[PDB]
Amino acid sequence: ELDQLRQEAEQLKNQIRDARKACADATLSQITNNIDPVGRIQMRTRRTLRGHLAKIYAMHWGTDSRLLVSASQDGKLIIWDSYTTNKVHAIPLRSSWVMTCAYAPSGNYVACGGLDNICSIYNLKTRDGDVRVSRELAGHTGYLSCCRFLDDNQIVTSSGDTTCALWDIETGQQTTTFTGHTGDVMSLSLAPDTRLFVSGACDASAKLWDVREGMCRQTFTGHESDINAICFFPNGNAFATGSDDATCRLFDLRADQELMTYSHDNIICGITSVSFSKSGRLLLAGYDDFNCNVWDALKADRAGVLAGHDNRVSCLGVTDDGMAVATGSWDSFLKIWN
Amino acid sequence: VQLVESGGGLVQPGGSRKLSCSASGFAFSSFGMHWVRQAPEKGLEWVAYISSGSGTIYYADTVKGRFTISRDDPKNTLFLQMTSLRSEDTAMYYCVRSIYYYGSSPFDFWGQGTTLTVSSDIVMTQATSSVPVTPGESVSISCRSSKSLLHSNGNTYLYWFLQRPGQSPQLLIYRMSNLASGVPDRFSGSGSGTAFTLTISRLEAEDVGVYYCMQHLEYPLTFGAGTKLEL
Amino acid sequence: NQFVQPSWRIALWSLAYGVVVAVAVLGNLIVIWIILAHKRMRTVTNYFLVNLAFSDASMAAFNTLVNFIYALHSEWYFGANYCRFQNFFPITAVFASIYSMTAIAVDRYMAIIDPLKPRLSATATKIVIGSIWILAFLLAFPQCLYSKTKVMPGRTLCFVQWPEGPKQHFTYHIIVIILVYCFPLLIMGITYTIVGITLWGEQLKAKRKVVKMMIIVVMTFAICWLPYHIYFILTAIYQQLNRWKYIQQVYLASFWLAMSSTMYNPIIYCCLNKRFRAGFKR
Amino acid sequence: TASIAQARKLVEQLKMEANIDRIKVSKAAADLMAYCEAHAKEDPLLTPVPASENPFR
Amino acid sequence: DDFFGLM
Amino acid sequence: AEDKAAVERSKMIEKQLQKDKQVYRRTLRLLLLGADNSGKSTIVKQMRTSGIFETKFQVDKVNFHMFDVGAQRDERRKWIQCFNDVTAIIFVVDSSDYNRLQEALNDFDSIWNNRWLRTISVILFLNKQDLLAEKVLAGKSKIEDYFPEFARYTTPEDATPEPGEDPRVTRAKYFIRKEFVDISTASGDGRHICYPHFTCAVDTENARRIFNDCKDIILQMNLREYNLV
C-alpha cells in the first residue's frame, strides 16, 4: 500500500509543476532586455587581512560594517578592524575544524562550529577583559555547516544530519527542529525581517522555512548538484543559490519557481559563497576557480571578476551599508574590496 | 573585579616608598593600567601609565625621574617606586585599568586607594564648582577644553566620572556619548568639539558627588577641578 | 709592447666565451623570471635560487665580459674609473655566487636529513642572503682600494690590482683560497655526501638522480676553481711569472673554467625538475 | 507500516505546497527590478562613491 | 710588458 | 581610547599568533579512516555525540595529531575537503573479514581518487594479521570465492621477510596488498604514494611506522619544493 501514497505523491508533484508553468508567463530575461546594463565593475583590493595560519572557511561582517570575525582551521577566530587591519580579539577554539562563523547583530556575541557538532557562543563584552565561551550548544548529529544569529538569545544552526534547528542560548536546548531535507544542509540565510529562512542542502533543493511554526513553506528543485551557498535578496522575496554544477540560480517566493540562471560555459568550478549587494543588482559569487565573479542579478551577465586570491574562495560578505566586500579564501588571507 | 592597593604612611621628604596594587578578578595582563592620585581637598591628577605587555610607559612631568612604574604579570601586581618624595606628593593614589581596542571602555574600574602622606598640556576647566540640587531635577555639568578633542578618526575623546563621598571614581560616559556598562540611562552625555555637557535627567541620592572630566587625546591626561553636587 | 694576439686565437677564445655568456645570461635571467613573475614557484625556498642566478648573471655580464676584452692583447679600454668598480662588484659576484651554493647546500641538508624540522623563515632567509653579500663586499674591498691603473705609453698592463708589495699579495690570496675555495668545498663535501648517502639507499630513480647532480656540483667546483686561485697565488709571490708571455693563455683557461660554473644551475634545474623545463619551453 | 507513516509525511508536506498563492512571474520579476531601481543610488558597489566618504581609502 | 689579470 | 594603544594590542596578538605558528608548523596532522570492523578504535588505545576525536602522541620529539572522525552521517563527500593539506591518511582495513574487503577497496578508491586528497599520501595499516594467519591455517574460509583471481596468482620472488609461516598466508597477505596497490599505482599520479604495512592487535611499533612514513612524506614535499625531483 506504499504505491497508493507514492502515485499520489507524484500526482501532487506534477500538480505543483502545472501550477508553476501557468505562472511562468514572462522570463526575467524578457522584462530586463531594455533595462540598461551595469558596466565593468572594477573593484580593487583595499585591505588585506593577514594573520590566520590555515585556510579560512567562514567570515561574517558585523552590523556596524567595521568589525568582522573570521574562522580558520588552525583553530581560532580573529575579530578584525577593517579600517585599520587591526586585531581586536583572537579567540582560540576547542576544535580546529571550524566551518561556520557568525557575528551577532547586537555585537556582543560570536559563534563558531564545525566537525565537533557544537555551536559555541562567545561573550566578547565580559567584565573580566577576556573572551569566554557563553554557551556550548550540543545536539546535532552531523557536522555544523552554518549558524546565524537572530537576536542575542536565538540562533539557527544548519547541520549535516539533514536538519536545521532553532536554539535558545540561555536554556541551551532546541526550540524547534526543521526536518525536511534528505541531504547535508550546507547553507542558510535568514530573511531581513528574521521571520523566515532558506536552507540549501546536498539534495539539490532549497527549502523556505518558517521560524515560529517550524514548517516548510516552499521547496525549490532547480539545481543539478549540491547547493553550497544561499543568500536572501535584500527585500526578502527572492534568494540566490550557489551549487557545484557551476550555476547560480535566483528564485522567488511569491511565484515559487526559478527566475534566472547565472551560468557560463567557461566556468566549470562550483560556487562556495554567494552574496547580493545592497540594492540587489550585483550577485557576487565565490568559485573554486580561485576567483570571485560579479554577476548582474537582473541581466545574468558577468560584469566583473575579483581575482586576487591564490586558492579557493570560501567566504564572501557584503556589509550592511553595501560599502565593501570581504572575501576569505584558503590562502589564509582576507581581502576587502571596493 | 577588584583592585586593592598597599603602601603609604608617614614618609620623610628625602625618603622612598613603593606602592603596590594587587589585581584579582580579571585578565590583568591584557589591561593597560594607570596611576591617578588625588591631593587632599583637591581634584584628580594623573601620575603614570604602563601598557599591556610593558610597552609604552608614560609619566607625568611632575613625577618624571623620581617615579618608576613597573608590572608583574604572573603575580598580578602593579608597582610605583618613588625615589625622592617631595611634599606635594601627599595624595590618595588610585589604580585604574584601561583596555584599548575598538569599542572598549577605558578607565572603567578604579581601585580603592592608599594614602601616602609625606611630611603643551590640554587644560580642562570646569566652571561651576558647586551646584545645589534636589532629587527630581535635571542638571547639566559643563566642560571646556583648550584644544578640540575631536580627532580625525571621528570620535571625540572626553571621559566623564563621578566620585561619591567616601568612594572611588566610576566611569559614566566614555568618548562623550557612550553610556558605560552599569550606569543608568539618566546620564545622557553629549557635546561639541570643544564644549561638552553631561545631562542627568532625574537625580537620585546616589548622584551626589564630584563629577570630573578627562581627555584622552594627548597623553598627559589632564582632569578638571570637578563640579560638586550637594543636596 | 706586445701580447698582441693574432686574429685566429681572438676568434677561438671568443666563440668559447660568447657561448658561456649566451648560455648564462640567456639561462640565468630566465630563471629569475620563472621565480619572480609567477606565483606557484615564488616561495621562500627559491630566494637563494634568485640570489645565485642574479649573482651568476652579474658574474657573466660584468665579470667575464669586461675581463675578456682586458685579457685579449690586454688594452684596458674602459678608463680609470670602471677599474675601481671592476674590482668591487664583479669580484663580489664571485664570492656571492659561491657562498650562495654553500647556503643552498646546508638548506638542502636540513631539507633531507632532518626533514620534519621547519625550515628558515622569510625574514631569516633574507638576513642570510644579505650576510652573504656583506661577507663578500668585505672581501672584494681590498682590491677596490688598491686598483691603481698606472698605464704605460701603451695600454698593456694597466689595471694593476695590488701595487704595494708581493709578500702581502700572497697573504690575500691565501685568505681567499681558505675562505672561498677550501671552506665551501668541505661544507659541500660533508653536506652533499651525507645527503648523497641518504637518497641513494620509480620515485627512487628521481632520488638517485639528485645524487648525480651533487657529484657534479662538488666536482665541477673543485676542478673549475682550482687553476683560478693557483694563478693568482703563483703570480702574487712570483711576480716574474707575469712577463712569461704565455701567461695570457693560462689565465684565460683558468678564468674560463671558473666562469663555466655560471651556466650550470639553469642546466641542473631543468635536467632535474619538470616545472623548470616547461618554463624554458615557454 | 513504519515507512507508511514516513511516506504520508511527504504527501502531507506536498499538499501544503500545492495549495498556496502563486503570483505571476512577470509580477515577481517586475517587483525585483523595481527594488534595484529604487535603491540604486545608495549602492556603493554599483555606483561608486569618491575617496572622501570611502572609509577603506 | 706585464699582464695583470683581474679576479 | 588612543589608536596607538589599539595597534599595540594588535601587535601583542600577532606576537602570540607567531608563537602558535611555530607549534602548528612543527606538528604533523593525520586522519584516521576505516570502517567499524577495522581496529581503528584500538590503535588509538595502543598509542601515547562529539563528531571529532583528536589523539596527540609524540615519537622522537615530533608531535602528531590524529583525527578519528566519528559521530557523522554516511556520506563523506563534503567534510573530506576539510582534511585537504593534511600530512597523511591512516587507512585501516580489516584483512581478516573476506566478504567486506571489496567495499574496503571501494572506499579506498574514493580516498585515492578524491579531488581534494590528490596530494595526500595514504598509510595503509592492513590490520588484524593474527586473525588472518589463523584463517588460512584453518583453511575453512576461502579467498577464491570472494576474489576469482586468487587461483591464478603466485607469490613474487623478492618478498616475504617473515620468520616463520607457510606461503599460504604469504600468498594471501601479499595479494591483499596487491589489490590495494592496484588502486594506488594505476589511478594515481606521482604526487602521492601509498605505504602498506601489516599491523596487529597489540603492536607497539605502529607509532614508529607512522613516524618513518611521515618522514618520507615530508621528504618528497621538500624534494619538490627545493626543485630536486
- The verdict on a CB contact (< 8 Å) between A338 and D48 is yes
Q: In this structure, what C-alpha cell is assigned to residue C258?
A: 671558473
* Cβ-contact F217, C106 below 8 angstroms: no
Euclidean distance between CA atoms B122 and B215, whole angstroms:
8
- Greatest extent of chain A over all pairs of C-alpha atoms, in Å: 66
Q: Which chain A residues are closer than 8 Å to F3 by Cβ? A: 84
DSSP code, position F112: H
Euclidean distance between CA atoms A243 and A245, whole angstroms:
6
Q: State the SS3 of chain A.
A: CCHHHHHHHHHHHHHHHHHHHCCCCCCHHHHCCCCCCCCCCCCCEEEEECCCCCCEEEEEECCCCCEEEEEECCCEEEEEECCCCEEEEEEECCCCCEEEEEECCCCCEEEEEECCCEEEEEECCCCCCCCEEEEEEECCCCCEEEEEEEECCEEEEEECCCCEEEECCCCCCEEEEECCCCCCEEEEEECCCCCEEEEEECCCCEEEEECCCCCEEEEECCCCCCEEEEEECCCCCEEEEEECCCEEEEEECCCCEEEEEEECCCCCCCEEEEEECCCCCEEEEEECCCCEEEEECCCCCEEEEECCCCCCECCCEECCCCCCEEEEECCCCEEEEC
From F14, F73, F82, residue closest to A97, measured CB to CB: F82
Asked, for residue C1, whether it belongs to a domain, the answer is: no
From C143, C157, C255, residue closest to E2, measured CB to CB: C157
Range of the domain at B42: 3-116
H/E segment holding residue B50: strand B44-50
Answer with the one of B54, B87, B116 that is the final residue of a domain: B116
Shortest Cα–Cα distance, B14 to chain F (Å) = 35
Q: Which chain C residues are closer than 8 Å to F228 by Cβ? A: 108, 210, 213, 272-273
Shortest Cα–Cα distance, F69 to chain A (Å) = 8
Backbone angles phi, psi at F196, to 5 degrees: -85, 135
Same domain, B204 and B135: yes
Beta strand B195-200 with B139-144 is antiparallel
* Cβ-contact D30, D38 below 8 angstroms: no
- Residue C146 burial (CB count, 10 A): 17
Q: In terms of Cα–Cα distance, which of C121, C115, C65, C63 is closest to C94?
A: C63
- Secondary structure of residue B29 in the 3-state scheme: helix
Which residue pairs from F98-107 have beta carbons closer than 8 angstroms and sit at least 24 positions apart in sequence?
Answer: F98/F135, F98/F141, F98/F143, F98/F146, F99/F146, F100/F35, F100/F37, F101/F146, F101/F176, F102/F146, F103/F35, F104/F35, F104/F38, F105/F179, F105/F180, F105/F183, F107/F33, F107/F35
- Residue B190 burial (CB count, 10 A): 12
- The verdict on a CB contact (< 8 Å) between A12 and D14 is yes
Residue located via cell numbers 537582473: A298
Same domain, B71 and B141: no
* Cβ-contact F31, F69 below 8 angstroms: yes
Beta strand B3-6 with A164-167 is unpaired
* Cβ-contact C24, C32 below 8 angstroms: no
Residues β-bridged to residue B98: B32
- Which amino acid is it at B24? S
Distances (CA, A) of B21 to B28, B111, B210, B219: 11, 8, 24, 22
Euclidean distance between CA atoms F179 and F185, whole angstroms:
10
Q: In this structure, what C-alpha cell is assigned to residue B145?
A: 577644553
Handedness of CA B118, B119, B121, B124 (dihedral sign): positive
Q: In terms of Cα–Cα distance, which of C111, C260, C95 is closest to C192?
A: C111
- The verdict on a CB contact (< 8 Å) between A53 and F17 is yes
Radius of gyration of chain B, Cα coordinates, nearest whole angstrom: 17
Asked, for residue B61, whether it belongs to a domain, the answer is: yes
Asked, for residue B122, whether it belongs to a domain, the answer is: no
Asked, for residue C2, whether it belongs to a domain, the answer is: no
Euclidean distance between CA atoms B3 and B110, whole angstroms:
7
Q: Is B101 on the interface with F (CB under 8 A)?
A: yes
Asked, for residue B72, whether it belongs to a domain, the answer is: yes
Within chain B, where are the H helices?
none
* Cβ-contact A282, A301 below 8 angstroms: no
Taken in order of first residue, the domains within chain F and their CATH numbers are 27-225 (3.40.50.300)
Backbone angles phi, psi at B20, to 5 degrees: -155, 130
> What's chain B's length in residues?
231
* Cβ-contact A207, A198 below 8 angstroms: yes
- The verdict on a CB contact (< 8 Å) between D32 and A20 is no
- CB-side exposure of A137: number of CA atoms within 13 Å? 32
Encode A91-125: b = buried (16+ Cβ within 10 Å), e = exposed: bebebbbbbbbbbbbeeebbbbbbbbbbbbbbbbe
H/E segment holding residue F107: helix F101-112
Window C:57-76, CB contacts with E under 8 Å? 67, 70-71, 74
Q: State the SS3 of D24-51.
A: CHHHHHHHHHHHHHHCCCCCCCCCCCCC
Euclidean distance between CA atoms A116 and C100, whole angstroms:
48
- Secondary structure of residue F193 in the 3-state scheme: coil
Same domain, B21 and B104: yes
Question: Residue B100's domain is classified under what CATH number?
Answer: 2.60.40.10
- Which amino acid is it at B217? L
From B30, B102, B103, residue closest to A130, measured CB to CB: B30
- At residue F115's C-alpha, the angle toward residues F79 and F63, to 5°, is 60
Same domain, B90 and B147: no
* Cβ-contact A41, D45 below 8 angstroms: yes
Euclidean distance between CA atoms A255 and D25, whole angstroms:
6
Distances (CA, A) of F137 to B136, F132, F133, F168: 98, 9, 6, 8
Question: Best residue in C62, C70, C151, C246 to probe E by mutation, most E CBs within 10 Å?
Answer: C70
- CB-side exposure of F154: number of CA atoms within 13 Å? 3
Range of the domain at C195: 7-281
- The verdict on a CB contact (< 8 Å) between F17 and A51 is yes
Same domain, B99 and B151: no
Q: State the SS3 of F52-101.
A: EEEEEEECCCCEEEEEEECCCCCCCCCHHHCCCCCCEEEEEEECCCCCCH
Helix axes F101-112, F167-186, angle to 10 degrees: 30
Q: In terms of Cα–Cα distance, which of B138, B101, B143, B108 is closest to B227?
A: B143
Strand order in the sheet with A227-232: A227-232, A238-243, A247-252, A257-263
Shortest Cα–Cα distance, C116 to chain E (Å) = 41
Euclidean distance between CA atoms C216 and C213, whole angstroms:
5
Q: In this structure, what C-alpha cell is assigned to residue B97?
A: 585599568
Residues β-bridged to residue B68: B81
Which residue from E minimizes the CA distance to C236?
Answer: E4
Euclidean distance between CA atoms A88 and A77, whole angstroms:
11
* Cβ-contact F52, F67 below 8 angstroms: yes
Handedness of CA A24, A30, A36, A37 (dihedral sign): positive
Euclidean distance between CA atoms C25 and C58, whole angstroms:
9
H/E segment holding residue B8: none
* Cβ-contact A301, A275 below 8 angstroms: no
Q: In this structure, what C-alpha cell is assigned to residue C21?
A: 655568456
Within B5-127, where are the H helices?
none
* Cβ-contact C28, C262 below 8 angstroms: yes
Task: Evaluate whether chains F and C are touching (3 or more beta carbon pairs less than 8 Å apart).
Answer: yes
Encode A46-83: b = buried (16+ Cβ within 10 Å), e = exposed: bbebebbbbbbbbbbbbebbbbbbbbbbbbbbbbbbbb
Rama region for A178: left / alpha / beta (φ>0; ψ in -120 to 50; rest): beta
Q: Is C126 exposed, middle or buried (0-12, 13-18, 19+ CB in 10 A)?
A: middle
Euclidean distance between CA atoms B35 and B50, whole angstroms:
9
Same domain, B89 and B150: no
Residue located via cell numbers 593539506: F85
DSSP code, position F194: -
Euclidean distance between CA atoms A319 and A284, whole angstroms:
12
Taken in order of first residue, the domains within chain A and their CATH numbers are 46-337 (2.130.10.10)
Beta strand F63-69 with F27-34 is parallel
Helix axes C89-110, C126-144, angle to 10 degrees: 150
Q: How remote is the C-alpha of A178 from its chain's centroid?
A: 17
Q: How remote is the C-alpha of D40 from its chain's centroid?
A: 18
> What's chain F's length in residues?
229
Same domain, B108 and B145: no
Which residue from F minimizes the CA distance to A145?
Answer: F79
- Secondary structure of residue D54 in the 3-state scheme: coil
Euclidean distance between CA atoms A135 and A214, whole angstroms:
23
Asked, for residue B166, whether it belongs to a domain, the answer is: yes
Q: State the SS3 of F151-192.
A: CCCCCCCCCCCCCCCCHHHHHHHHHHHHHHHHHHHHCCCCCC
Determine the number of helices (DSSP H) and then strands (DSSP E) in chain F: 8, 6
Question: Residue C232's domain is classified under what CATH number?
Answer: 1.20.1070.10
Euclidean distance between CA atoms C110 and C118, whole angstroms:
9
Q: Residues with Cβ < 8 Å from E6, sequence gap 6 or more? A: C67, C70, C86, C87, C90, C91, C159, C161
Asked, for residue B161, whether it belongs to a domain, the answer is: yes
Q: How many domains does chain B divide into?
A: 2
Backbone angles phi, psi at A131, to 5 degrees: -80, 125
Strand order in the sheet with A292-296: A271-276, A282-287, A292-296, A302-306
- Greatest extent of chain C over all pairs of C-alpha atoms, in Å: 67
To what resolution in angstroms was this structure determined?
3.0
CA-based end-to-end distance of chain B: 31
Beta strand B44-50 with B32-38 is antiparallel
Q: How remote is the C-alpha of A310 from its chain's centroid?
A: 22
Q: In terms of Cα–Cα distance, which of A255, C11, A334, C153 is closest to D27?
A: A255
Helix axes C7-24, C264-272, angle to 10 degrees: 40
H/E segment holding residue F205: none
Q: In this structure, what C-alpha cell is assigned to residue A111?
A: 559563534
Asked, for residue B121, whether it belongs to a domain, the answer is: no
Q: Residues with Cβ < 8 Å from C95, sequence gap 6 or more? A: C135, C136, C139, C140, C180
Euclidean distance between CA atoms B1 and A334, whole angstroms:
37
Q: Residues with Cβ < 8 Å from A295, sequence gap 6 or more? A: A248, A262, A282, A283, A284, A285, A301, A302, A303
Euclidean distance between CA atoms B96 and B32, whole angstroms:
9
- Residue F5 burial (CB count, 10 A): 23
DSSP code, position B43: -
Residues β-bridged to residue A79: A69, A89
Same domain, B141 and B105: no
Q: In this structure, what C-alpha cell is assigned to residue C196?
A: 648523497
Q: Is D2 on the interface with A (CB under 8 A)?
A: no
* Cβ-contact C272, C265 below 8 angstroms: no
Euclidean distance between CA atoms A28 and A255, whole angstroms:
12
- Which amino acid is it at C210? V
Backbone angles phi, psi at A245, to 5 degrees: -95, 25
Same domain, B17 and B85: yes
| Residues after which chain F has a gap (C–N > 2.5 Å) | 48
Same domain, B87 and B192: no
Task: Evaluate whether chains E and A are touching (3 or more beta carbon pairs less than 8 Å apart).
Answer: no
> What's chain C's length in residues?
282
Determine the number of helices (DSSP H) and then strands (DSSP E) in chain B: 0, 21
Q: In this structure, what C-alpha cell is assigned to residue C219?
A: 666536482
- The approach used to solve this structure was cryo-EM
Same domain, B41 and B104: yes
Euclidean distance between CA atoms D55 and D49, whole angstroms:
10
Distances (CA, A) of A42 to A62, A303, A323, B52, F45: 25, 9, 14, 42, 56
Euclidean distance between CA atoms C168 and B100, whole angstroms:
64
Euclidean distance between CA atoms C182 and C178, whole angstroms:
5
* Cβ-contact A239, A232 below 8 angstroms: yes
- Secondary structure of residue B45 in the 3-state scheme: strand
> How is chain C classified by DSSP, letter by letter?
------HHHHHHHHHHHHHHHHHHTTTSTTHHHHHHS-STT-SSTTHHHHHHHHHHHHIIIIITTHHHHTTTT----STTTHHHHHTTHHHHHHHHHHHHHHHHHHHHHHTTSSTTS----TTTTHHHHHHHHHHHHHHHHHHHSS-EE--BSBSTT-EES--S-HHHHHHHTTTTIIIIIIHHHHHHHHHHHHHHHHHH--HHHHHSSHHHHHHHHHHTTTTTSHHHHHHHHHHHS-GGGGGGSSHHHHHHHHHHHHHTTSSHHHHHHHHH-HHHHHHHH-
Taken in order of first residue, the domains within chain D and their CATH numbers are 4-56 (4.10.260.10)
Q: Is F52 exposed, middle or buried (0-12, 13-18, 19+ CB in 10 A)?
A: buried
Q: In terms of Cα–Cα distance, which of A237, A213, A241 is closest to A226?
A: A241
Q: Residues with Cβ < 8 Å from B55, sequence gap 6 or more? A: F8, F12
From D20, D31, D44, residue closest to A323, measured CB to CB: D44
Q: How many domains does chain C divide into?
A: 1
Q: How remote is the C-alpha of A298 from its chain's centroid?
A: 20
